[PDB]
Amino acid sequence: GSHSMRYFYTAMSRPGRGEPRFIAVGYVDDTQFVRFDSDAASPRTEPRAPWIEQEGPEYWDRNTQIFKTNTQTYRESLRNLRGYYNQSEAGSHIIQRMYGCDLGPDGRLLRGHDQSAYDGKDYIALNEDLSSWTAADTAAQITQRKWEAARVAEQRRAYLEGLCVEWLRRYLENGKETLQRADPPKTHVTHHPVSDHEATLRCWALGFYPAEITLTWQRDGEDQTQDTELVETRPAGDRTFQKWAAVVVPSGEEQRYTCHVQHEGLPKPLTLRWEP
């Protein structure tokens, strides 16, 4: 199917507690594969998935050089943004960056991304054309001018259409037994009375990968969007994910309710009901 690579950078200032922390993690789809943390006893790029371990010394050294350099440039950038917003030196602030490439089911580039935020708000993003920028405010317009002057977009475009896709393809092949395996959800419906007159039906999906899934309840074949309690999809810790959806129904009316499950790993979409 479709696949993506992303790097996520977080740079956090902490006045009075040393220099800003820089952390980078890399993902293919829902699988992390590398980390770097400037706070580590010996900051270096470390593998986080077995299929990346086969990369040579030059790969690790090159990654580490890049993240060490970013640690320094992001510290300068934090200073710069503090100034752009006329902020005092007393507060802690965060720059986040997420970038990478998306491939379609044929393996060709679907689109690229290079997005930044400041204190959790959109700051600047590379447009889908990979040639122009969208700045959130007049501070970000200053970054935009700097990046335009330095032809940054042209360099991101080269990476996103080139190395990004090339490496993602390599990782997909090297990790094909996991990265290209969809594990379908194991499902069941539970029943718990909440009173004499109502009961909870909870539809469970466990052990699935990737995280993308759709869980809905219908009553008489009609979507119950407003009445359904849906927890956020959550990691199990073994690569797989979990989710449930719950509905409170009148006792006696249980068979009017159906749980529907869509997941990439499913030969056919599931329809489930409570089985007393």
């Binding site: 790969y59 990654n63 890049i66 440039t73 300068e76 330095a150 360099q155 190395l163």
Partner: peptide, 11 residues
């Protein structure tokens, strides 16, 4: 593999 930068890249 992550992307590189020109020297002295900054926001």
């Amino acid at each position: 593999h992550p992307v590189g930068d020109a020297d002295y890249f900054e926001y």
